[PDB]
Amino acid sequence: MMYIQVLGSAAGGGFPQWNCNCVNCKGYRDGTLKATARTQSSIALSDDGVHWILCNASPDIRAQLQAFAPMQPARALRDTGINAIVLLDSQIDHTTGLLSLREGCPHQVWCTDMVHQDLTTGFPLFNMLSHWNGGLQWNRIELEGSFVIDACPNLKFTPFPLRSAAPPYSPHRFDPHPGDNLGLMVEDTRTGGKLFYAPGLGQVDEKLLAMMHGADCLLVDGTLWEDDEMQRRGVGTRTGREMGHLAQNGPGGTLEVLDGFPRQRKVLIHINNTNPILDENSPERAEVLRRGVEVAFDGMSIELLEHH
Amino acid sequence: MMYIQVLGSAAGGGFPQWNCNCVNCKGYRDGTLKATARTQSSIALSDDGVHWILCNASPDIRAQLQAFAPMQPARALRDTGINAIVLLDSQIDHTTGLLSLREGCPHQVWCTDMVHQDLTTGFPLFNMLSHWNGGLQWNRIELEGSFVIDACPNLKFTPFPLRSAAPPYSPHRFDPHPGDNLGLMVEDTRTGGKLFYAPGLGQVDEKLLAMMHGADCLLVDGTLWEDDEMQRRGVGTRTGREMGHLAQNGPGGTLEVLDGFPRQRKVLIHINNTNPILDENSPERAEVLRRGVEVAFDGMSIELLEHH
Ligand SMILES: [Zn+2]
Ligand SMILES: [Zn+2]
């Protein structure tokens, strides 16, 4: 059994976003909209429900941990369910949470060389946290092969490279390198059950579709419904392509991509506050569910039992 | 009228603390203890209830803003009640919140030279955030005199130096300098009403007591009940003196110090998860209230009407 817990299901900024008054955010606050608040994207993985691997440490980590009981096993006066942390990129909304874990150092942190570079220079979390009882102990994620974290020895992680898009603070933001971003394939080696986790997906190719067809659950980028969604809401100018996010709708959208995966479980995650699928009464929500695709929410539990 | 909003009232780690199972934290989670959850220390100030000055940006800032309606005036599709931010030190639990405000840059940030140094080197928030639409615009807090933030032109801030204790990440942590920590005197220049804000107070002297007697509301360090409180709970070794916090109890404690201030309003803030005054049925809580001292809580509103 592979346990997948959705701690946070929103894109950066959360839902509602602190400074946003778009139709969703303002409608939520006014109570005129049927939607559920969401923290910034993070999931927890486990092969026993007791030892947990964190994927991305969101700025909302304190509320996310508190909301999920297994994160506090209470086996001693100081204790936690986090046995390791995996970073998919060096972005601020995926790493800031580590600062809130300073009281429980050391932590094993798995990330690529490029991400380790960013996090020892432009956002030197490793340098900062090292003053707290050994800080973060780096474990290198290689750009080939797989890795196993001893706390969950039945989980086999196979990372795959995504289009390099280093954070704006990154010394090499204008110089993208392989290792800047990745998606995860996670396999329960006892059953064969595979999770495909790609919260940040800007493009698909043949190699990608091939490994998706080998997976049992598809947990993918659901940031924007339309590529110019920020313009439509009137709260920004950046497109989904500029942000490295494939929209759900239109030709080449994820919904069209997901049509070739009828047998896989399909869940949209990392959803922006502007996305209509957050409105549970939207025709966009209805279309998603009509296509057999789920919309992730904070507290969602995905059980991965076996392999197709 | 001076409005003071308590966004967060706990010391670092919050209450409950993510990794802590002391009598308070575990008792809260079990529901066997009568206590209220608290986010990490931060207050908001205003002279009109519309424009707000943030003091310290806690890691819990997203939940703190969402919980206080004036933080979202909803005057445009993107908007906020934060018009300026004041930092009292460069500690992680007082500055991390700034990262969560990247979507609404630029922000005016007021802090001392020493704090600006830390935040451009060991924790280079200013360097990181500058890639977000102008980032943080530094306004120097001088170690003498006062300053006025134009958004709240009736609020006069007079900072006062506290014992220098630079954060562990700080290049000059072993070399403390004046400007590392300060407390605030805030005056409504229309009424004369003064707030004394010293969330981090490790020692008192004659100069300190003299300016406290000139204030109307005393909002001070309430981290530990006892100096060896971390040892008593069994969750650490550090003392309140090692942490730069004066305990409430015993000779020289804050309660004894506050006895010489019968006319002032007295509120304890920045309270550690281990502190018995969090237990609303504790004899420690009872003693505090018996001495005319209040225990701050998340969402507390303090109205400063006039001067004694
Ligand atoms: Zn994100
Ligand atoms: Zn919005």
Ligand SMILES: [Zn+2]
């Ligand atoms: Zn603090």
Ligand SMILES: [Zn+2]
């Ligand atoms: Zn505790």
